[PDB]
Amino acid sequence: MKYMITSKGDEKSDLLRLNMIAGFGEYDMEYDDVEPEIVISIGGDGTFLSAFHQYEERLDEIAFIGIHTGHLGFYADWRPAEADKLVKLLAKYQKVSYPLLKTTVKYEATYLALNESTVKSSGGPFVVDVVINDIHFERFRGDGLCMSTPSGTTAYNKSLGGALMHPSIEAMQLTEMASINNRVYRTIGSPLVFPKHHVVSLQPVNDKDFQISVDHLSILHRDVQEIRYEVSAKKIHFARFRSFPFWRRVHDSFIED
Amino acid sequence: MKYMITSKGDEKSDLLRLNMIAGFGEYDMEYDDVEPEIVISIGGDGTFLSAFHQYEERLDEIAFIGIHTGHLGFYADWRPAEADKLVKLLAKYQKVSYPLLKTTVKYEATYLALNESTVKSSGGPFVVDVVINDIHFERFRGDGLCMSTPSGTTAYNKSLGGALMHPSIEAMQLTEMASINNRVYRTIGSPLVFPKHHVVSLQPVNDKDFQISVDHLSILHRDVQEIRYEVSAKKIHFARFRSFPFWRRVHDSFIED
Amino acid sequence: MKYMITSKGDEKSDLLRLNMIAGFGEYDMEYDDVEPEIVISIGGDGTFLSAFHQYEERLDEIAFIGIHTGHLGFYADWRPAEADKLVKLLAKYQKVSYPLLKTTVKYEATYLALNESTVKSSGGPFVVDVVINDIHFERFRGDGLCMSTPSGTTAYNKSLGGALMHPSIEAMQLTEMASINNRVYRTIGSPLVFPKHHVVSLQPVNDKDFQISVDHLSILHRDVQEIRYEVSAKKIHFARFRSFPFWRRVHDSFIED
Amino acid sequence: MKYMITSKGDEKSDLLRLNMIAGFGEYDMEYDDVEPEIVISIGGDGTFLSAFHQYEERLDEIAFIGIHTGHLGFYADWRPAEADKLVKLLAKYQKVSYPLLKTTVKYEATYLALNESTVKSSGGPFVVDVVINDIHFERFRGDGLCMSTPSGTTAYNKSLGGALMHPSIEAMQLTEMASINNRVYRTIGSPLVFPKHHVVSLQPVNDKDFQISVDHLSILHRDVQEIRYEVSAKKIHFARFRSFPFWRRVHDSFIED
Ligand SMILES: CN(CC#Cc1nc2c(N)ncnc2[nH]1)C[C@H]1O[C@@H](n2cnc3c(N)ncnc32)[C@H](O)[C@@H]1O
Ligand SMILES: CN(CC#Cc1nc2c(N)ncnc2[nH]1)C[C@H]1O[C@@H](n2cnc3c(N)ncnc32)[C@H](O)[C@@H]1O
Numbered sequence A, B, C, D: 001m002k003y004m005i006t007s008k009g010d011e012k013s014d015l016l017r018l019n020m021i022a023g024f025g026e027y028d029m030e031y032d033d034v035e036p037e038i039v040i041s042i043g044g045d046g047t048f049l050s051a052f053h054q055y056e057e058r059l060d061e062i063a064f065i066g067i068h069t070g071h072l073g074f075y076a077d078w079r080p081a082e083a084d085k086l087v088k089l090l091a092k093y094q095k096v097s098y099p100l101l102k103t104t105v106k107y108e109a110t111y112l113a114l115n116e117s118t119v120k121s122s123g124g125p126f127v128v129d130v131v132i133n134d135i136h137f138e139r140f141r142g143d144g145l146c147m148s149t150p151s152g153t154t155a156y157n158k159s160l161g162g163a164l165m166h167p168s169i170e171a172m173q174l175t176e177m178a179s180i181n182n183r184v185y186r187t188i189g190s191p192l193v194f195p196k197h198h199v200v201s202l203q204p205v206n207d208k209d210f211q212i213s214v215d216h217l218s219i220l221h222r223d224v225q226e227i228r229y230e231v232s233a234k235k236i237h238f239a240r241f242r243s244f245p246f247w248r249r250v251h252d253s254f255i256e257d
């Protein structure tokens, strides 16, 4: 089938990429970066995120694979030494799917996030009303908010005090960035975990300009009327070759390897 | 059908209980506290928890209802003024189910928790190995651990920094109590959210005596070899009469009412 | 003696300012906004912060006073109804002094902060080496860092998890903003409280552009070689007329009033 | 002068203790465990804490020294290889003093803490009114409270989210253990740092039995009317032989060594 390989760009990743293309050439495998069925990322989790967004319009037809040439990643979770075994088994596997986060920006534009989407103010203070399923929940004032996917909970969400969720749970998690809490403003404080079909809506109070991020991309959006978050109906599909449990991936990354 | 009413014991709850029994008497309703189909709790969330554990052997055949005579509760979420309307509609509704936590103590004994189950040391230091699906995850040293149900996340879990999960998500959440983290002991720190069929196992390192709690009940268990946590196959069934969304219940309890 | 009054600008503050000037005119008091001995702020804590920085070059010769026309402030801690009594007693008091934070930016420029000084990245990732008294302490990667004065601990420092310090303690407190902590980057996590004469130095790793804030002012600094923090030798002097203990000010602002 | 050596009890500590006594015998040094001027602890920080409380009645006349036979401690901060050099220099140094915490239990009894003093309930719920300098600050409900010395901030205080304070600051820090915060109970949440002469008083609401700890000692106190915390007028004196800065001790223990 058709495949493509993206590289971090350094010497180690480019050389491993050319070795895998050479190995794939020994099989009935066609290199195609327009309509591939297999997308292999060689580098780090950031390289994988770029590979994800490069082909986010054909997610239903692609199985992703991440190879880490540096430290272990949560998406790039295979070592370079296993690359030849990867080529062989790719040539002849199972698939697993992770949930995604859909962000809607109304002035509308839509985006998919594999890790998270965050909102911060343009320059002045950040004040938004948080609406959950069309009911006003809180008026947040602080540095910003972060809405994370399950596989994203080990990233920005973790540094903000959020919980780590197993990626088989179809949910999204909202966490706060340095909220003010006194006799005036009151926020929930705790991270919030929302199931599928729940819609979390951010609405401006005064300033309507916001710095909105989706994974690595960050854009200053002007004249924003609303930001809608919900668990996406689309999922990202990984090629699975052996058992690397998520909790073991957490242990190896944060406890010790 | 058969019903029973439990009371907090104070004058307000006992008087409301006798008024509801009198109202139920005007219908084809039989008071029975042995095999009831309807269990009404009048008091607080603690009164509801006692009502839950009193009939935990017939959960599949009971619809629970909570009336709060004090402040709003997450289980006792109906005001005394609605009691007469409750009697009428009970006489002729829909049902909603929340997940439960199964705790297994091997020396074995099993328990169901509606809020959470916690483990603390008998007297000396608390050290346990945390095993997730038969793989060693961390060696925890600290004050204790708390495993929460979704509806329990707004209780002890919240005070420990855990996330608030909508009760439609079949999961359990583990949080830490004052863990040591230095060049010796290392814990994950973040709360962990586990899906159904995941088994979290606590195993002793030196001391084998532990103070184990399940909701309000707390027992000193001796010669403990293992404590197993998993999302229960059983669920608690609530009688539903109108929409009181969980997130609104969170807003009314923690933001303002 | 000479005095001046600054106003938030709204109708309530301007009208109270003109009433106090009229009351001061009934005494031997000279309005002077060039070399005043008394600086009265009417508005909120933000109005007071602007009054502080307007006269930061004559701190040793000025007694500050804050009047809150909205909610209680930690610097604007006197109600408008007490303004006439303030005029009388000003005309004939004691003084109390709070510590300040000195920030040095080397490319050098120096700044005084009454609340705090923060460092965030220009656009990309924020990575700095933290040096305490000329010894490397940690390599911080995250959103930013905040160094707070004692009276500033109830402001940005509090939202970041820092401790509240009584302003009689000559110290500064450093807190983290969403730090990464895994098998690569390692930060202390806890807030750090430094005494007088301790020098905390932030040094760039790759990017040398930083968004540096001092109280309300925020400047993008380019080609930064170092940022030095230390407890200032200067202090801000408040005119004291009665006992409003700091801990009571904390209770009234955060517990209830 | 007179000296004594306490040992953890294991083979390594006892053997090092006998070697130091033999080395001290080659000088005009008298072993005395009744009225020593030098108290050497060989083991861990726990061994040092026991050595501190064994001679807490002669703190003004004793210089303490800690040797760690295991991992580095904050009080036992000298390696066994330096023991012979310690004997020589002891025979002929400077002294440094750390602040202590005085706990008063009224039914009265007084205690000194080098690390911290904590309060937890006897069995039921823990509810106390927190009084700061004779003014009611908050009604705390939760697992307990911890009042830490500066050198104690790296111990229990750190695991509870408190700040790390340099031990030259004469202060005490109060932190919360899992407090309830809703529309009923309200606590400050943040750690509180109190200067000298400030008195923090814990007063019972219903239950008058409390589990009170001071460093390693923990006693169930009955019929408690009040618990008073204040920075002690006494200090612990360490023998200083070279520079091991506190912040370096923090870096070596928590960042890496
Ligand atoms: C760095 N870029 C490529 C990547 C990655 C990645 N993904 C994961 C994952 N899923 N699990 C464990 N590690 C991971 N690394 C963009 C990502 O930087 C993260 N980020 C931004 N600011 C952060 C902060 N202050 N603290 C922690 N993280 C932060 C955001 O998550 C953003 O997406
Ligand atoms: C008090 N008893 C009856 C009840 C209740 C209740 N349940 C909920 C709920 N689900 N959501 C919102 N409020 C709720 N209250 C037993 C419960 O006391 C909670 N608990 C114990 N120590 C705690 C602490 N340090 N901090 C917060 N909570 C604590 C444990 O959760 C235990 O189950």
Ligand SMILES: CN(CC#Cc1nc2c(N)ncnc2[nH]1)C[C@H]1O[C@@H](n2cnc3c(N)ncnc32)[C@H](O)[C@@H]1O
Binding pocket: A141, A142, A143, A177, A178, A179, A180, C045, C046, C049, C074, C115, C116, C151, C152, C153, C154, C155, C156, C157, C159, C215, C216
């Ligand atoms: C708002 N401006 C005028 C003021 C004030 C003020 N000072 C105090 C005080 N000392 N104590 C109690 N309340 C106070 N309000 C500038 C201040 O906004 C604060 N800030 C910025 N971002 C924040 C965040 N994410 N969370 C909390 N605070 C934040 C920074 O502290 C900055 O200095």
Ligand SMILES: CN(CC#Cc1nc2c(N)ncnc2[nH]1)C[C@H]1O[C@@H](n2cnc3c(N)ncnc32)[C@H](O)[C@@H]1O
Binding pocket: B141, B142, B143, B177, B178, B179, B180, D045, D046, D049, D074, D115, D116, D151, D152, D153, D154, D155, D156, D157, D159, D215, D216
């Ligand atoms: C273990 N025993 C001897 C010792 C010591 C020690 N002192 C220091 C110090 N000053 N700095 C850095 N490490 C230190 N270790 C009693 C001490 O156990 C600490 N502790 C109790 N429960 C804890 C928890 N849940 N989390 C962290 N700590 C806890 C209490 O602090 C108590 O005093």
